[PDB]
Amino acid sequence: LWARIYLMPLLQAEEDRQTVRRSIAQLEREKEIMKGTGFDVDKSVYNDGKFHAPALMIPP
Amino acid sequence: AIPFEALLPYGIIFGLLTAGGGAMQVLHVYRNGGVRDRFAIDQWDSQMMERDLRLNGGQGRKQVDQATAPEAFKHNHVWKSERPLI
Amino acid sequence: MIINIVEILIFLVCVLFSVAYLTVAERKTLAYMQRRLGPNFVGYYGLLQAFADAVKLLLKEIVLPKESNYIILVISPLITLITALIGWVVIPLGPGITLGELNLGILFSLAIGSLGVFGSLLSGWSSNSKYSLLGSIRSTAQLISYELILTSIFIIIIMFVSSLNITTIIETQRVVWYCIPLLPLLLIFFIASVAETARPPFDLTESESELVAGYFTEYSGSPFVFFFLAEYSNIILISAFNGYLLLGGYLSFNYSYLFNILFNDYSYVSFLFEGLINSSAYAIKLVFLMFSFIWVRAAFPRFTYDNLINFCWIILLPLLFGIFLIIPSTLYIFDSFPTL
Amino acid sequence: MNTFIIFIILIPIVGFALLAVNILLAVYKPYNEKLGAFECGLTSFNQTRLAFNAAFILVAILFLPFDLEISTLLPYVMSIYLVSNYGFTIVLLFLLILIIGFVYEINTNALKINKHNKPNTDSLIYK
């Protein structure tokens, strides 16, 4: 148990950076889709100012 | 004294279960690639096995040890897309 | 893909043989208890007797009497067959050697032994007779009544492991077996195991009921070979349950020192040798246990249904309530609760 | 494709195959005196409905409330370390509430069937 909590922030930082990178990638991709017609890709549907990972994507 | 004819079908049952277990263990080790099975797998352990399969490159439990990870390693990260569940 | 189909082929063919020779070994040892030889006219020393029975039994015709639903009559052998055979996955022949390793294998082993009651009860209504239906009633009531204390013995054992995985139990068992602290539990699990198959210490249907041949009297051919296979698969399956949660599953001794003498390195001959030792220990547990079933068949008369229900509900079950109270209290008094 | 699901698909095909080799290979050849249920070499009339004892039905009606407890003790046995000293007493109280209903059952002798084979208790008073 103490071994796993010694490992936790090391792995949590890695999944953290993956979440940041792929989230910003998705936001820029939807920005490059919706060019032209006016639509705020950058605005988040949550009213809180805190950052949130996207979900519920279009079926690939 | 002890009858061999009574214990001879038990000798068969013993030999069939013994050869079965031995052949199965050899098939499990040939599946892993020379090492033993993992007999109880946590959620943590399952995520960790997926991470290792991402680290080594293709092979199941090659178990690499390197200082610094490769460059395709930062890009081969996967998310799992689950269907609607209607 | 080639490797999982050859392992399931070899486990199938090892278990489906070992349920055939069980019946041969049964007639052999029951003969020598009664001071007579078993079969010796069918193979060199009487072996492949069960194949003679099976090949003839597939050649007898199937008769479906006029009062019967013909579908139900032929589908109860199939469901009793598969239910007595689906439970062979979850047994380990060594550490993590199953046919599907799942995290909760006891709950599966306990839900399949719940599915086996139907092929008794449902088979009572096919060829509906009032002398057959009530015999199916008595059989089904006995069958569920001892399944209760079966399930309870399980949950008393899982009090020590707190994990529904099975190879986790056997790895837990390496410090000490569970038969040697819990000795009365071995005796009452053995008699509940004898009850759950309706063995002839605890039988009433095959012999005493108004049918001369149990609930399956009116049959021939494939509906008899499937019931016959299902009863002895049930024999070795509840023997397997005893083998892992109460006696040592694949554990015999430590065998580290013998290895440090013999071997030098991990190689396929070493995994083969370790697999032979582990499944040999499991097999000798299971063979001593089938010998105990055949041994208790030889020496005893049978039960009235009143004796049987008075046995289960009035004697064994209050004692079991005392066991429910005493064992977590013993884990309580000393500071030892089992961790997930 | 694990080797768990080959098995659950694979037992039936073996059973269907053995049933098929019986249906294909044995003769069929029935008639009326072959058909008909077996009771000891004598036909008879079956009665349309027959009576039964209350303990016969009571075994399996009573079976289910004990079965539902045994599956209610199954959530506890997996979490027995976490609820140290506290869930222990709650499970004690749960089992004791069950045990007093059980001693109701054993005091009423609900599952016991009596015998009407009385040995003529009443003595011989004359005149």
Next chain:
Amino acid sequence: SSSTPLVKTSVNYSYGDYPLIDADPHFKRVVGYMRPSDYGVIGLATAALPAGICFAEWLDPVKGKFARPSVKFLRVATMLGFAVGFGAAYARSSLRFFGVTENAREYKKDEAQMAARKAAGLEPYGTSSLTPELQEIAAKNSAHSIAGLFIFPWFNFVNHPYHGREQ
């Protein structure tokens, strides 16, 4: 470490005129602080059930003629009467901890006993063999359970750190 409440708690939140002692007193403290009138209530209810049954037969007898009830019923009347007397007893004595009745006698005892635990260098409410999350959950179960004494008996046996009080 095993003493942090990790909660927000009402502080000296009196339920009547008088200042509270506990938000739930432990069973041991309630049995310790009960008055001689409280043991009198226990004795009243032990005597009232068999005398009540013999009275209620003397009003209208069961079999038409007056006889006394059997000792089989008087034994169970005594038991259930001690049960009613103890329930009334525990409820009366817990009211004085909550500050809804007169507790000037018991409040001095609690000044003295909380001052004695400080001198003996130990916890203010007991070392308990529970993790602090289990102490908090166990005394969310046992909080204010003297209401609803009509339905079910429930008591406090956990030595948990919060009792609605400062320090």
Next chain:
Amino acid sequence: PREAAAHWVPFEDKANMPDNVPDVVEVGATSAPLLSASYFIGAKCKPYNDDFMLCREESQGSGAIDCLKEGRRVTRCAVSVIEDINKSCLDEFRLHWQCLEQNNHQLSGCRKAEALLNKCVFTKLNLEKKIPGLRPDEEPVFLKKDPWIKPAVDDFKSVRAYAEAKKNGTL
């Protein structure tokens, strides 16, 4: 937090971290090396891991983007630990995690290589393996003699190396 079920489809995205975030070396160690060096990366990198989780606590729901600067340093210092343990005792570290490759990665089954590795790292990398939360008059479990729970098979390389370290007197 919940498992994927009912026909999950894995997808990857060929994309890059933006310009304003500096580049960071990631850990390439696998589950048996990581579980081996867990106690020593927890001994060297306690305040950095603590800074990361404490930042992530204080900025609620910010989460990802606002404590990125500190999750840089935890990965860097754990890479420092594993590079140093490679260069110090590659052979005995390897002996340890190759033992842990068998026995379900149970730490219970590899005591005799673990003693060698703990001595070698305390001698040269001078980090000690400890279990916190353990009040005194309670023996730590990887120090005890005759444990109840012994492995099925002692691996051969670490029994031989343990006996050779007895004979050398370094143990």
Next chain:
Amino acid sequence: ARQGSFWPVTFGLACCAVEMMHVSAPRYDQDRLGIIFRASPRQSDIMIVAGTLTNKMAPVLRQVYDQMPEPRWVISMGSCANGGGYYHFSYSVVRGCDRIVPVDVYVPGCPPTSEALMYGVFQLQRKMRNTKITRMWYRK
């Protein structure tokens, strides 16, 4: 397969039934031949009329014989079971089960010795050697 497993219904009713229970005895065993009494005609290959046949049982003997699945034989054990026997000139007797069931092997003896009953079983198994169920369909 029809020989090495060999299942009679235990119809034996009188004097000749105990003599059959000496074929179940440990001196002349029948388990060692493959013989077992499935005591229901739905599963027995063969029948043994071992004892007398009165006029009150002739429909009962036929109804037991009617039920058995189609590869079926019957052996007639005793002298009361073939041609009446000791009770040949009696008002309530059938002069052998030849009138009722079609019999393949006659075992003679009034208590036909367990030796001789086993010999009748070996003679029936020899009749099963040359049954030719699959050569017959080629129309030999």
Next chain:
Amino acid sequence: INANPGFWNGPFRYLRWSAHNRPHLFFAFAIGIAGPVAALTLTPLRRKYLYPDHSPLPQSYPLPQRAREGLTGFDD
């Protein structure tokens, strides 16, 4: 024949009568009553004499209650 005295007429004589003539009920209740009575009266003796209680296991990452002092090293 053996009749019931009842628990009330003589206590210990009823306990003896249950032990001789209804041993399944008497010993089922004996094994049941040995549990919680011992759990009440034997555990403080163990905590005083045999060994004290174990320290609790962690469940999540243990957060301290501090205010993020500055750290040096691994800037670039």
Next chain:
Amino acid sequence: TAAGISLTGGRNRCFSEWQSFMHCTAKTDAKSRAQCLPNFEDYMECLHHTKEKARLREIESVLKQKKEGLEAPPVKVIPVKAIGLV
């Protein structure tokens, strides 16, 4: 009760939005809960993802109308036995 207990005993998926709404209602008397609307709106769409599905169908209706379609760094799908292939 089990207000925010998840499947593993942890906190559920929308615990933070719910605890933020409970912070909003703790410091606030009635006749002034009209300011507590955005925390509730955030909680309900954390539960049901209504505004999120609305935004995604607004951008999916544009995606099918382009003959060019996708000019971006694309998302590549992989089979399950090819997590770390290259």
Next chain:
Amino acid sequence: MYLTYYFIEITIFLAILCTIFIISAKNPMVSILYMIALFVIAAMYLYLIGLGIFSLLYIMIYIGAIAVLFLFIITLLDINSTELSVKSNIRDLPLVLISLIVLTISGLMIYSNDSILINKLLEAFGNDYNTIITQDWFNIENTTLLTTIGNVLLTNNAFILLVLAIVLLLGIIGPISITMKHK
């Protein structure tokens, strides 16, 4: 690979099909056997959604106790039944169709919160977006689902377990007390 996609929808169709053989079957116990099949279809759906624990709790409790009880009743008791004749239920058919439409749509209605009624229904069908599952490394032990149920039945809702004991007690006392005939 995409053969494994429509499984959930298949079970829905299969479950639909099973109910038509429950309400229309000449023999009773054949229809109770179709109900046992419907429990099996339910347990298929519960494994398929991700709840492998429950599926075996359904096969244990519902199939192995409740259905065994039902079949055990139908055996030794007398129940008349009439076949599904067209002449007796063709009078029911229009209220059947009206209730199918209304009860089905109105069951699909309350999952949604627009004031406009037609916008309530269409949000029932807009599910085709695929939820993204992310790996979080915050949990250190194999708390399964059954462990968490045993923690919440036993600490936070211990009283519900205890009132449930009173209910199981009642389920013992009741059937006994009916079917005694004391003396």
